[PDB]
Design a binder for these strands. Structure first.
Length: 180
DNA sequence: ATGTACAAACACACATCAAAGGTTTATAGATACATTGAAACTTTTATATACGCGCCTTTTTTTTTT
């Protein structure tokens, strides 16, 4: 392989443990996008770490755009601190990353036609809307989006580690299906 | 001599029975709504990937009165 699956989004859940006044949360924040007509969750974008989070009336926050487990975790801790400054005793309790989506590259042109045709059972293709293949692995259970540019979009894991394992499993397939 | 009010036949005029049928309507078939709970349904996003299209937004061209 020799290629790290480069994460582009990490979505995580944080139980602040309080019924947050989403109106006051929006009011006391600096740049927060909350109005009920789209969702029941204040969405805040913090530039450091730059993450976008929706926090619900349950006080549960789901965070996206992180580049690491620690980007999301530190961002969520900052989010809880911001909520506490707002006035609600937010606390980092029973945190869990619900999604780790990444894009990386293997850089060798691929016979995507070969894979999809011979892995019709596993991968399906209708190249007249979107030129990417969809592949599944159960161990680890990662779904992977493949495009001729070599871009690999690995999704379906709470951790980047399942991303890494399925990438170490799928890059050999890619090189096998490398078009030249 | 002598036929007359009176009541029996004796076959019949008279009140009665009975089949048929419109009309009314519960009564039921079927009817069209009225309930509601329930699951089949919507949403973010970002995230790149590689598209348009229309609409944000703007530059260049286009058009009536004194």
């Amino acid at each position: 392989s020799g290629i790290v699956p480069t994460l582009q989004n990490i979505v995580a859940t944080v139980t602040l443990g309080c019924r947050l006044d989403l109106k006051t949360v929006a009011l006391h924040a600096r740049n927060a996008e909350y109005n009920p007509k789209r969702f029941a969750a204040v969405i805040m974008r913090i530039r450091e770490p730059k993450t976008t989070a929706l926090i619900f009336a349950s006080g549960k926050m789901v965070v996206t755009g992180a580049k690491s487990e620690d980007d999301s975790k530190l961002a969520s801790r900052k989010y809880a601190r911001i909520i506490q400054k707002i006035g609600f005793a937010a606390k980092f309790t029973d945190f869990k990353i619900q999604n780790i989506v990444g894009s990386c590259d293997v850089k060798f042109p691929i016979r995507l036609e070969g894979l999809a045709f011979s892995h019709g059972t596993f991968s399906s293709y209708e190249p007249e809307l979107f030129p990417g293949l969809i592949y599944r692995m159960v161990k680890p259970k990662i779904v992977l989006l493949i495009f001729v540019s070599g871009k690999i979009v690995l999704t379906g894991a709470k951790q980047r580690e399942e991303i890494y394992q399925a990438f170490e499993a799928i890059y050999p397939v890619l090189s096998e299906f490398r078009k030249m």
